[model samples]
Target: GLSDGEWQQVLNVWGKVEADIAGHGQEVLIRLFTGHPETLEKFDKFKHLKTEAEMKASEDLKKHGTVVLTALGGILKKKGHHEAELKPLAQSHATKHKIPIKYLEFISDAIIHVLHSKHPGDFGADAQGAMTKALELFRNDIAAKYKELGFQ
Candidate 1:
């Protein structure tokens, strides 16, 4: 549950980022895979992309990245009041995608990095803190869902 101020912080920065969802989303995924190559293996579409050039050029990667950010935008737009939606997403990833929870953390880190890098003046420490806090709740909900699905 984000406070009013926290919600505003996220939405302000998110407003700018969402303007270029495809570009920003691709940047986030590239950053994620670049720092944690192991996580790249989880994405069949992106797994074959070895170099940054390939990742940036791949339509699959760009499409998936846009999808990722679009999903996130839907949730954030509601001011984080969509726990019901998260359960299915968490369950599907846990049972079907087999994504380890740690990878979510990497994604969050990459997201925050991209947001800050793209808008250093707007996404300052407070905004980063707010986004981090908001994502912490998201991760915890997914972790709980994973546990319920019998994933260790």
Candidate 2:
């Protein structure tokens, strides 16, 4: 659903910070919990870390962050490609992690602020909307699987 140039823009933005996977992942999750306090309940282990520095230093937290960032890369790759890739991932989240679909929304929305700051050039509204829509697509994908699994 993205144009060639827009797709390139998204990649260009992601490329600069992709190397710092741990920080990138931690930041988004932090933003999510900061904005919505209730989500922290699910992350009882990491939530107790409290301070940002404390959480950043935790190996468990970093590992989860890396996992999130890694999964994010795979999801972004599906923007113009195979959407089926989401089903299994979504299924795993529901069956294993038991993550609610709303958390996907939280992550997507949380990442937008990351893009706003980390994006090198003057990213505009179009690009923001594109990324938001892309996340919405992924969120819907997860929601579909959630529905299929009766998590809805």
Candidate 3:
């Protein structure tokens, strides 16, 4: 149910960030686009190639970043989880990047619209919170699995 325009933006932003992480490593913190699972997966792949400090930093970043996204998603869901409902907050968020409120509204609408349209069952406060928790747990499991595979 995503508008073609909105879906294109999602693919453009998320797909590009994912590709860069796949190709370049976890040093690039594309926070606006990359989600927790994608970032953690990339970190797991690249961790073996890093020094001890880099690995530690990656782990730290992953932990904090996941917490931030999870909290944000939870808060946004609680705040209504609808584009029209979230437009004001989105305006403030975009202002941090010096983007105009109008553009932020469009982007926010696009995102909420896409999520609501594509994954109808995945909206609401409880759903968002649970998904965030599940993603974090899954990321931890994936890290452990990688460790088992001889990736330190």
Candidate 4:
């Protein structure tokens, strides 16, 4: 639940990330794997990537990163009907992939970290707060969907 003003700030900062979606996504994945190596095992495509350098060079990692960010961008840009946008994603992760809810938060943290590092000026306190709130809401929505799907 973002205030209108906060939504605008989120949109503004997200624009910068979208400008180079693949690059930012790749960095976010790298950062996530660095901080929480266990999460890497969740991705069959990335589980075998053992080192930072290996993770960075993998085409599978790059494509998966882009896919992750693309889905997020779709949710953010969809505005009012976020549940509808997020349902399939929640199903895919919770049921199909059997991913834990906490993993989503980990990825979101990596996304925020990448944003702040890449656009310190544009992603000031207000923008950061907005983005954080939005992602928080996003996670909540995903959790709700997981519950509805009987995902535990």
Error of 3 at 47 (Å): 18
Q: Report the C-alpha displacement of residue 49, candidate 3, in angstroms.
A: 14
**Regions of model 4 farther than 4 Å from truth:** none
Q: Local distance difference test, per candidate? A: 0.87, 0.75, 0.38, 0.85
How should the candidates be ordered by TM-score, best one leading? 1, 4, 2, 3
Clashes of each: 0, 0, 0, 0
Residue pairs with clashing backbones, model 3:
none
Lowest-sum lDDT 10-residue window in model 4: 77-86
* Model 2's TM-score against the true structure: 0.83
TM-scores of the candidates in the order shown: 0.95, 0.83, 0.24, 0.94
Tens digits of per-residue lDDT, candidate 2, 1-152, equal 67777676667666755878888777777787778877877776866867667765778876888887887777787665746677788888899778888788878878888766665466678777777767777787678779889984
Clashing pairs in 4: none
Candidate 1 TM-score to native:
0.95
Q: Candidate 3: give its CA RMSD in angstroms.
A: 17.5
Between prediction 3 and prediction 4, which has the larger lDDT? 4
Q: Please give the ranking of all candidate structures by lDDT, highest first, separated by commas.
A: 1, 4, 2, 3
lDDT of 3: 0.38
Q: Is candidate 1 or candidate 4 better by lDDT?
A: 1
User: What's the C-alpha lDDT at position 34 in model 3?
Assistant: 38
**TM-score for candidate 3, residues paired by index:** 0.24
